[PDB]
Every structure is written in C-alpha cells, then in structure tokens.
Amino acid sequence: SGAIYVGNYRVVNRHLATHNDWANLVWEDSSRDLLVSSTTAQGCDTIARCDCQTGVYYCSSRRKHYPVSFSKPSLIFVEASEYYPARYQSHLMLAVGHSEPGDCGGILRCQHGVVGIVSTGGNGLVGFADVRDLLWLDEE
Ligand SMILES: Cn1nc(C(=O)N[C@H]2CCOC2)c2ccccc21
Ligand SMILES: [Zn+2]
Numbered sequence: 001s002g003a004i005y006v007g008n009y010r011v012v013n014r015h016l017a018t019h020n021d022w023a024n025l026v027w028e029d030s031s032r033d034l035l036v037s038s039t040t041a042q043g044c045d046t047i048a049r050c051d052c053q054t055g056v057y058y059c060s061s062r063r064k065h066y067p068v069s070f071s072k073p074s075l076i077f078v079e080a081s082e083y084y085p086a087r088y089q090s091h092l093m094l095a096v097g098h099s100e101p102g103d104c105g106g107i108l109r110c111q112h113g114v115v116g117i118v119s120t121g122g123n124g125l126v127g128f129a130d131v132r133d134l135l136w137l138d139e140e
Pocket of ligand 1: 015023033078080081082083084099100102103104117119120121122125126127
C-alpha cells in the first residue's frame with residue numbers, strides 16, 4: 001500500500017483505489033495502473049521533473065529503503081495477477097530489487113523529488129509507475 005500526496009491530489013495504484021477515491025476521481029489510466037483522487041488537506045510530497053535513472057524506493061516487505069538503477073519509462077509486458085490479465089503496461093520502469101505484491105504504492109524518489117510508485121515485480125525485479133510526465137499534478 002501507499003500513495004503520493006502532492007497539492008490537493010492523492011496518487012495511488014489504480015488496483016488499490018478505494019470507494020472514496022472513485023467517488024472523488026480526478027484521473028485514472030488502467031494501462032499505467034494509476035488513479036488520482038482529490039483531497040481536502042494539502043500534501044507535502046513534490047514531483048521530480050527530470051530524466052534520472054537512479055533513485056531510492058521504499059520496500060514495505062523489508063521495512064527498508066533501497067538505492068536502485070532503473071530503466072526509462074516504457075511499454076512492458078506484465079504477467080497476469082489477481083488485479084489484471086497479462087497485458088502491456090505503459091510508462092513503467094524496471095529495476096533489480098526485492099518486491100512482493102503488497103509493496104505496491106511505495107515511493108521511488110530521486111534528488112529532484114518523487115519519481116513514481118511501486119506497481120509490478122517478482123524474482124528480484126521491481127517495477128515503478130512513472131508520474132514525472134503528469135505536469136498537472138504540481139505547477140499546472
Ligand atoms: C510489486 N509487485 N506487484 C506485483 C503485481 O502483481 N502487480 C500487478 C498489480 C498492478 O500491476 C500489476 C507483484 C507480483 C509479484 C511480486 C511483486 C509484485
Ligand atoms: Zn531526478
């Protein structure tokens with residue numbers, strides 16, 4: 001679990017969105033595994049606006065933050081899960097790091113700010129849904 005809280009937005013994995021998220025929907029994209037809802041309180045996270053390929057992510061199944069090198073956002077085949085059939089996910093970045101299904105929502109960050117959230121993984125890989133192209137989250 002986990003979310004990004006920037007301005008009056010809450011960014012979560014679409015597959016973990018609650019009824020309250022759907023009832024306060026701003027934007028969602030199934031191909032990216034992302035959903036954004038509106039918040040009453042202002043958040044403290046800021047979004048990175050960069051092309052970094054190194055950063056640090058939070059792994060809830062280890063209670064630890066790990067440094068990672070990651071690929072640029074791209075279209076990658078993701079195996080079937082209880083949340084989606086096997087399909088291509090867009091704007092996804094892969095890294096070598098531990099992950100388990102419930103690690104989704106952990107933040108990946110770089111020196112500039114938040115880069116994205118854990119969305120896919122297995123067998124010593126972890127995949128992150130990029131948010132750096134969503135300019136409307138923070139200075140729009
Ligand atoms: C971090 N992580 N995520 C999944 C996963 O199945 N994600 C789907 C749900 C949303 O997009 C694909 C996974 C599986 C096995 C080990 C780790 C894992
Ligand atoms: Zn950066």
